[PDB]
Design a protein around this motif. Structure first.
Motif, PDB file in Angstrom:
ATOM      1  N   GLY A 229      83.934   4.875  47.584  1.00 52.08           N
ATOM      2  CA  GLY A 229      84.141   3.384  47.220  1.00 52.08           C
ATOM      3  C   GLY A 229      82.772   2.867  46.742  1.00 52.08           C
TER       4      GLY A 229
ATOM      5  N   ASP B  34      80.674   0.600  47.083  1.00 57.01           N
ATOM      6  CA  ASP B  34      79.778  -1.158  47.819  1.00 57.01           C
ATOM      7  C   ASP B  34      78.851   0.128  48.605  1.00 57.01           C
TER       8      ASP B  34
ATOM      9  N   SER C 228      80.716   1.336  52.657  1.00 56.70           N
ATOM     10  CA  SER C 228      81.734   1.777  52.252  1.00 56.70           C
ATOM     11  C   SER C 228      82.002   2.709  53.122  1.00 56.70           C
TER      12      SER C 228
ATOM     13  N   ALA D  81      85.622   3.807  53.603  1.00 53.22           N
ATOM     14  CA  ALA D  81      87.064   3.886  54.080  1.00 53.22           C
ATOM     15  C   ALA D  81      88.090   4.573  55.157  1.00 53.22           C
TER      16      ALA D  81
END
Ligand SMILES: *[C@@H]1O[C@H](CO)[C@@H](O)[C@H](O)[C@H]1NC(C)=O
Ligand SMILES: *[C@@H]1O[C@H](CO)[C@@H](O)[C@H](O)[C@H]1NC(C)=O
Ligand SMILES: [Cl-]
Ligand SMILES: [Cl-]
Ligand SMILES: [Cl-]
Ligand SMILES: [Cl-]
Ligand SMILES: [Cl-]
Ligand SMILES: [Cl-]
Ligand code: NA
Ligand code: NA
Lengths: 482, 482
Positions: free
Chosen positions: B180, B182, B185, B187
């Motif tokens: 990702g 950012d 991040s 996930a």
């Protein structure tokens, strides 16, 4: 974002902070602009060979691993005045002693060349630049700045480090922990269950990132019996409530027929006259023995008596209702006494869930009173009894039950009577008429006869009497073949 | 580090890549050095006003969110030749169409000013600089470079993005997932249980970071019955092995007295003559009924018989051994038959775990044969029996058991005999001598007498015979007071 701990803040000092410059005279100089704004300026773009240093005070490191260095500055365009550069250099040195004025550039490691995004030709264009360095290990460090002929104003210098803050989450406690140096750092931090919380069956963990964010919760603690979760801790159940287990659920309010609870109750006590069975959960309301079977009928259909009843009007709030039947004999003599052992029931007369039973083998003319009692799970805990009575007299003893075992054209007949009565019968008497004053009787000691020499396709009236030194069946209609 | 997917690699192209320059003539130019090395150079430090652009080809974005841009370059010192700058600018533009030669600087967003750490005065001093940009959303993008009068050679340009790779871990499968945009991040990616694996009771999850690292494993799958974990998958149990549950354990080898297993067995079958009880776990070896109690003694101490025995030599591999005792009578008449209902045992004669019992109430002279049988949990599954026999004759019937209930100076005496024998006794006869030809006898139908008119501090010989129309106790020594 998490916790920043600041280590140095030039702007936040209003000039009273004083930094070493090498050489003492030339190069960087503190400037005040007036509304006082302070800053460190150098602008010797003319002189052919510059090496100007600005060294901050010794900064105590504490527990910091990676530091973040935030600078705010202006740079003037080398083409904006008619040996020039538009960048500067940022260095640092670790050290356990503060050396004071004794400053030696050779001990300083270069972090980076700092360049501006925007350049002025004087619009107050303030560049911002962040760098970071780590891991640090000594007691403190210095920053520095090197100018080789740039026209720079240096307005701000913030060094801070990041922490994951002290945290209450999932009914556990997590200590303030230092964000680690490496970017892929996730430090696993064990949590401590807050008072009156427990791990029941996963143990609480959090992961501290380099930016000081707590990242992935694993496990939790739950408030134990008598306690629930209020905000971030466990609280005693309110008066009027209970909780029996360690769960993630609130306190349940007290069930029916129960006594108002004090704080931190694991179960509410039973109301006067109400009870619980040793299998009932704390969540179950207090209950009581049921009322009597609402209706009972005792009917003497034939030689047998049929008892049919109905569940109690009041169950005492239970669903485990059983029935039991008992019997008294009375000769209308006047004398009375318990039922004889010769009375049978169509179903063991205790532990009944059915609402009817058949009673057989009964002495004629005798006044039988049957009592049917209702009991639920809490009955053993009271002395009282809930029952209904009903009385029956019987006239005839058990007749033979007679069926056709086969036919022709003749009628092959069989019968039965219960083995206790079989001693009483001297002989059976079979009567057969044609369907007005001419019948044929035969006799046997056995339980079957074949009627012979009969007309084809004919209705016959067959009766079988049980004879004694008695009781006769219903008339049956049996038809021959064609 | 995880997966890099490269989107552009200038050096890796050996010159055959051709980039737009604005203006067409002046500014940036491709240069080859010969061993061919290619590069993009601009060095118009003299000319007063430069704005030279170099724009890469349109780069297809695919699934990338954050791109990483890696540059390698040299910059010459503005003081090294006698309107000069030592930095350049890096821009980018997103776009869904490739515009070809139509290039418009106004559509390009500035990423950063690129400055060198080392500067040449010609030692091949190669600066490296990385920047990144994201999230991207259009179909593709362009990079560009702007020179305003620097003497730069640009030797390398790598754009890549990062992925968390397809992963087999904890007997689950995790798909390749895009890192990702950012930095904070993580996930969460659900895993899929590989074939023949299951989640038993936490479901498998992994967390994909911005650098493409998989960070914190939560949960796992376990290989189910008949299967174990081999490397990253589940495999059928070897021939000769078994596994009955879904666990994180290997296949267990077949226990004792068992038949070699085929692949993927949940339990090994029993060897001929060996068995398992319906409570035995698959891990338990096949067992068999035990041998006979190794030794048995039948001793007729008094009127009672004592049977003492010993556990079997062979238990058939079990620990749930019970004993049961049975009895035959034989009159040495010759006739024989089962034991009478008048024989009692010191302990219910079946389900014995003790290795001894007392047998009482026995008819004298009669030849009693006692059989004691050994049975374990698998006994109900064979017809055969394992027992030992032992024979005893008894002479005397049960004498009175006599004790002192008190004394003075006199001797207060009581006795007892088992209630079945109490009908047989006509009268009891008490004899008392002083401890050579002068005794005193009394008689009672009851079970206690007080001996009167006795000498102080004296030893008396007391016997109590049970008399019939018999059997007498041992001689007791009872001493009076002082
Ligand atoms: C028995 O039957 C009579 C009628 O014959 C009934 O009225 C009476 O109440 C019954 N039982 C008792 C014990 O009273
Ligand atoms: C019964 O006792 C005799 C000795 O009196 C013994 O030898 C015999 O084996 C016993 N029982 C049987 C059934 O043989
Ligand atoms: Cl001042
Ligand atoms: Cl670093
Ligand atoms: Cl007759
Ligand atoms: Cl070329
Ligand atoms: Cl960005
Ligand atoms: Cl006498
Ligand atoms: Na740099
Ligand atoms: Na910048």
């Amino acid at each position: 974002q998490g916790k920043e701990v600041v280590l140095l803040d030039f702007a936040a000092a209003g000039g009273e902070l004083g930094w070493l410059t090498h050489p003492y005279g030339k190069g960087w100089d503190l400037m005040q602009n007036i509304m006082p704004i302070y800053m460190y300026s150098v602008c010797n773009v003319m002189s052919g060979d510059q090496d100007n240093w600005l060294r901050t005070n010794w900064v105590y490191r504490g527990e910091a691993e990676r530091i973040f260095i935030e600078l705010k500055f202006t740079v003037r365009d080398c083409n904006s005045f008619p040996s020039c550069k538009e960048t500067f250099n940022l260095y640092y040195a670790e050290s356990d002693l503060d050396y004071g004025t004794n400053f030696q550039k050779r001990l300083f490691t270069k972090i980076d060349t700092i360049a501006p995004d925007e350049i002025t030709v004087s619009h107050v264009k303030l560049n911002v630049e962040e760098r970071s360095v780590g891991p640090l290990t000594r007691k403190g460090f210095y920053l520095a700045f090197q100018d080789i002929g740039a026209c720079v104003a240096l307005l701000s210098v913030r060094v801070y480090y990041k922490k994951c803050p002290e945290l209450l989450q999932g009914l556990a406690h997590f200590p303030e922990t230092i964000a680690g140096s490496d970017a892929p750092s996730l430090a696993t931090v064990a949590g401590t269950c807050v008072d009156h919380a427990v791990v029941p069956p996963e143990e609480p963990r959090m992961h501290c990132a380099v930016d000081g964010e707590w990242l992935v919760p694993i496990g939790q603690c739950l408030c134990q019996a008598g306690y629930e979760k209020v905000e971030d801790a466990c609280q005693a159940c309110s008066p009027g409530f209970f909780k029996f287990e360690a769960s993630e659920s609130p306190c349940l309010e007290c069930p029916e027929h129960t006594l108002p609870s004090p704080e931190g109750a694991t179960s509410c006590e039973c109301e006067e006259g109400f009870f619980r069975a040793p299998q009932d959960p704390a969540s179950m309301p207090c209950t009581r023995p049921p009322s009597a079977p609402h209706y009972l009928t005792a009917v003497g259909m034939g030689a047998k008596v049929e008892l049919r009843w109905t569940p109690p009007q009041d169950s005492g709030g239970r669903e485990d209702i059983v029935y039991s039947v008992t019997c008294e004999q009375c000769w209308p003599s006047g004398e009375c006494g318990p039922c004889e052992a010769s009375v049978r029931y169509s179903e063991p007369p205790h532990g009944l869930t059915r609402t009817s039973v058949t009673v057989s083998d009964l002495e004629p003319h005798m006044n039988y009173t049957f009592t049917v009692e209702a009991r639920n799970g809490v009955s053993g805990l009271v002395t009282s009894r809930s029952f209904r009575t009903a009385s029956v007299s019987i006239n005839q003893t058990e007749p033979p039950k007679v069926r056709l075992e086969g036919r022709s054209t003749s009628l092959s007949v069989s019968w039965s009577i219960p083995p206790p009565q079989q001693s009483r019968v001297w002989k059976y008497e079979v009567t057969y008429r044609k369907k007005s004053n001419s019948y044929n009787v035969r006799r046997t000691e056995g339980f079957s006869v074949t009627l012979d020499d009969l007309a084809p396709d004919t209705t016959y009236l067959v009766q079988v009497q049980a004879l004694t030194q008695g009781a006769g069946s219903k008339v049956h209609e049996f038809q021959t073949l064609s």
